[PDB]
């Protein structure tokens, strides 16, 4: 599921304050940003330019400038006509996936699926009601804009994603070793203890962390969410609730692709 | 209405060692709408000069942000993350955990 997509966030708090954000993402990683002051596509990595030339990037810059300004102004203008209730959010995600092409583009109003772009036309989600159909009628007014959108989704993104992946192959396939430590958690209950194994600093995302007693995996291990840091690395906590007298010989084991078969083993000390 | 309360998770980039510089992260995910006030608190008072990531959203359109600051832990220093949102009657504070 190697997908590249552009996200658009438009927040309309009151009639005076409207904020616009455009960014580009290779899955979980952010690689591009939009600058309204300079109206430029800021590249967050040297390989974020991917495979295209400067002329193609300038053309994309002009297209994005026109599209963003016109879409912001139009959403402002059609707010009462489309029954958009202040305050409201408009969220858009659009891009391509994969080996293969697999394009997509969709828009949500107030956090729920509202409309999407399917072949050369905007189709409303049936559950969104008549407002989505009216929005699609407005969105399908200009055939030229729909043709540009179809070209962007079916041609520009598939050609861009291959070059972006090739130029970022070194960064994407890099291996960063994790580090781990142990700590106490909140008391689960009387006569019971919570043991916490933190793993931080690893890349890529997949990782294996388990509380063990010898070779026996402790199935009471509770693995939390994988959390990011400002660098590219990830963080994760694994907890185990045990009786106060049954905490001896317990340990935490971490397997990551960077460790090259040498699992990190930390041993619990309760003194 | 259809509003999603933020999930707040506090952690450190490295294990806490007194006198050693480290990073404190507050991750605020799965909230809607996006207008939010996330602050990092050192001993109650707000920490100035806090960096945060660009706004984004997950598959289900809920928003997430990462706030982080550089800090040197002390023996008697306590840290927390304080979040305000339309879904919160009072600000929610999640404390850092170090044993």
């Amino acid at each position, epitope marked *: 599921p190697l997908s590249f997509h552009v996200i658009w966030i438009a927040s309309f*708090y009151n*009639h*005076s*304050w409207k904020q616009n954000l455009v960014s580009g993402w290779l899955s979980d990683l952010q690689t591009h940003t939009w600058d309204s002051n300079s109206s430029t596509i800021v590249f967050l990595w040297p390989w974020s330019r991917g495979n295209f030339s400067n002329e193609e990037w300038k053309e994309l810059e002009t297209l994005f400038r026109i599209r963003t300004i016109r879409s912001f102004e139009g959403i402002r203008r059609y707010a009462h006509e489309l029954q958009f209730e202040y305050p409201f959010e408009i969220q858009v995600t659009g891009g391509c996936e994969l080996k293969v092409s697999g394009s997509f583009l969709q828009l949500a109003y107030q956090g729920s699926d509202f409309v999407s772009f399917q072949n050369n036309s905007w189709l409303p989600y049936p559950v969104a009601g008549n407002m989505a159909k009216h929005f699609c009628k407005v969105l399908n007014q200009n055939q030229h804009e729909n043709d540009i959108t179809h070209n962007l989704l079916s041609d520009t993104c598939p050609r861009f994603i291959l070059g972006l992946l090739d130029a970022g192959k070194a960064h994407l396939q890099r291996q960063v070793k994790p580090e781990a430590w142990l700590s106490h958690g909140p008391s689960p209950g009387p006569g019971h203890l919570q043991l916490v194994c933190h793993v931080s600093g690893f890349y890529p995302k997949p990782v294996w962390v388990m509380w063990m007693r010898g070779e026996q995996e402790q199935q009471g291990t509770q693995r939390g969410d994988i959390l990011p840091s400002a660098d590219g690395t990830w963080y994760l906590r694994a907890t185990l609730e045990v009786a106060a007298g049954e905490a001896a010989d317990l340990s935490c084991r971490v397997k990551h692709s960077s460790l090259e078969g040498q699992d990190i083993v930390l041993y619990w000390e309760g003194s | 209405g259809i509003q999603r309360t933020p999930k707040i998770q506090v952690y450190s980039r490295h294990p806490a060692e007194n006198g050693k510089s480290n990073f404190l992260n507050c991750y605020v995910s799965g909230f809607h709408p996006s*207008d939010i*006030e996330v602050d990092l608190l050192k001993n109650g008072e707000r920490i100035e000069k806090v960096e945060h990531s660009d706004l984004s959203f997950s598959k289900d359109w809920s928003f997430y942000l990462l706030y982080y600051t550089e800090f040197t832990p002390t023996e008697k220093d306590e840290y927390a993350c304080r979040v*305000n949102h339309v879904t919160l009657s009072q600000p929610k504070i999640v404390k850092w955990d170090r044993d």
Partner: T-cell receptor
Amino acid sequence: AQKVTQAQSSVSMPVRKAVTLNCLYETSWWSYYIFWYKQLPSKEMIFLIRQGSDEQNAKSGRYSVNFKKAAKSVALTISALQLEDSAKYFCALGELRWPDKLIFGKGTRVTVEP
Amino acid sequence: KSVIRQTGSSAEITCDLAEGSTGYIHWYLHQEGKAPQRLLYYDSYTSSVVLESGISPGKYDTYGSTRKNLRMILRNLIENDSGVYYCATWDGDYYKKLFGSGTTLVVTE
């Protein structure tokens, strides 16, 4: 949006005395401003004081405010009642983070007893 | 200061804000016994008038340099349009919202 209500149509108090005008608001903003304004007989609006949700009771000048923040009340007490202070006093609220239009109340006139 | 008009005509008022901030100007309507309310919001940087909820599409318009000579025009005015109109703007600090000179409009059949 939000609601603002001040019920007193008019009040009276002697010179060199004090009086308080009540203002009950109903909002869903966790950060907001409460503004007090005075309307002269010549139809002119004068800024009096601003009140912060995360701020202590503002007591600037001859005016003081009371924050029943749990009860959502911003009361305006005036001091050293003069003749010029006779006007129609209004309370409104606005968004602290995104300043925009003001939700005013019905208003309340004051008549200084001679 | 005072304007008298007849039903079905139009009236152009000007507002006197000392210098404003040459930014975003709100127009407020005040009536006796009622609460003053914002009628429209004018953004000079784009010359875009956004009307309040439930306001007729062409009832009000705004134009002119926002410094001192800022005009708001009401069309197809009815008896309910009588009242005192103000223009207001947030100062640079967004600390207080300065209100300009109000003009009283009287509409008679």
